[PDB]
Design a binder for this molecule. Structure first.
Ligand code: SF4
Ligand code: F3S
Length: 106
């Protein structure tokens, strides 16, 4: 499984969804997650994230491990996002801001 991590929160560029062969991306208000059962590990999405927040499950950073499970949980309750849309309003300022987990919107 591929995993979206902390830097996607309040960027949510959604460039990732256009390259996914199986539409395994689920949409939160200020975040996107990858359904772990549906993701087929092609990694087409990982270069496409400006946030560089997508990671192969085995290479998700030691301090962002919570996100594996979070992708799994939220992918069960969030609607499917298949089309690219415009980034969140102040996305490039928030990009690179650490610890945005505190601000994740359900
Ligand atoms: S690795 Fe491939 S299948 Fe998995 S979420 Fe990314 S684009 Fe979709
Ligand atoms: S910012 Fe998030 S919305 Fe997609 S392009 Fe990167 S994983």
């Amino acid at each position: 499984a591929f995993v979206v991590t902390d830097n996607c929160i309040k960027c949510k560029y959604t460039d990732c969804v256009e390259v996914c062969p199986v539409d395994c991306f689920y949409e939160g208000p200020n975040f996107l997650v990858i359904h772990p059962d549906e993701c087929i590990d092609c990694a087409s999405c990982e270069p496409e994230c400006p946030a560089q927040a997508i990671f192969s499950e085995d290479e998700v950073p030691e301090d962002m491990q919570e996100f594996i499970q979070l992708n799994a949980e939220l992918a069960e309750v969030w609607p499917n996002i298949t089309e690219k849309k415009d980034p969140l309003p102040d996305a490039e300022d928030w990009d690179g801001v650490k610890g945005k987990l505190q601000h994740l919107e359900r």
